[PDB]
Design a protein around this ligand. Structure first.
Ligand SMILES: [Mg+2]
Ligand SMILES: [Mg+2]
Ligand code: NA
Lengths: 176, 177
């Protein structure tokens, strides 16, 4: 409960203020919980952020298991209210490249999504639905690159125009 | 001449420190030019950023005219440091999305690139090289989304392995069958 309350409020706070602007005082205000309770549950601000990213990964992993990364992207188009949170995620990009400890933690906190993508694509291969003239890992990297592009695009304020059709094309490309 | 100097230092500074981290001191360090030289020129950090965006849009536009957005991306793989500063978009996305003035400036400063992509795709269509079962504007948006993906991956230190083969696949997809 307390943990949940902290996560729901923290997501709002980060989205509203950005990473640096999500001060401890603002996190208190957004959660109704003390700094002592927040850090008791999460240790530090970065771990709190990582918990949120892991929540994202779990949710995305579920959708992937149903209908792939393309369906995650379709959901992005349905959810414009989430763009502010997507922007916060993007702010940690440089740290991801330069801080080995944080990097490893970020990767670990995405592990459920990464595996789900792999399982999905395996299932698709088993069913003979993917093209076989291109290795499955090239197809994998292609889908991940489109996903990163979608996130960037939307977060930076590009319109929705033609994106559903772009997703149709993306799906068509990896199929037989 | 000096101006190419100030943009060159800015580029390296943005690549190294980010947008917020590009302090006057660090910009001086990178340009070795007194804050007065640097900003007399541009007024503020936003405008130095937008000037750089224009300069590199123009370079990309040249490449596009020769061999499309895919060739821009092949070049990014060949030397990721050239456009590494573009990582700053990932830092400032909410400002680019939510400040309509800034956003309009950003779009304007990329106009030469956008027109070159449109001219290149037109030429491809004229020669019957593009698939025609998907509208050309969907193909256009696809290619841009891929480029946005490439900038993100390189910003976060993703391996570039398999990406040349990904570009082959991208190129094959927009072509006729
Ligand atoms: Mg699908
Ligand atoms: Mg080509
Ligand atoms: Na052109």
């Amino acid at each position: 409960n307390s943990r949940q309350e902290i996560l729901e409020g923290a997501r709002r706070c980060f989205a509203e203020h950005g990473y640096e602007g999500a001060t401890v005082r603002r996190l208190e205000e957004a959660t109704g919980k003390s700094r002592g309770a927040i850090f008791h549950h999460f240790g530090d601000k970065e771990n709190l952020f990582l918990a949120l990213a892991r929540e994202d990964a779990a949710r995305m992993a579920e959708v992937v298991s149903e209908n792939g990364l393309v369906e995650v992207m379709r959901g992005m188009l349905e959810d414009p209210e989430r763009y502010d949170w997507m922007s916060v995620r993007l702010e940690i990009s440089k740290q991801l490249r330069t801080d080995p400890v944080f990097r490893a933690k970020w990767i670990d906190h995405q592990s459920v999504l990464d595996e789900a993508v792999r399982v999905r694509l395996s299932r698709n291969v088993d069913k003979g639905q993917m093209r076989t003239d291109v290795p499955i890992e090239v197809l994998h990297t292609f889908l991940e690159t489109v996903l990163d592009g979608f996130i960037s695009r939307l977060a930076t304020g590009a319109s929705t125009e033609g994106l559903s059709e772009v997703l149709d094309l993306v799906e068509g490309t990896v199929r037989k």
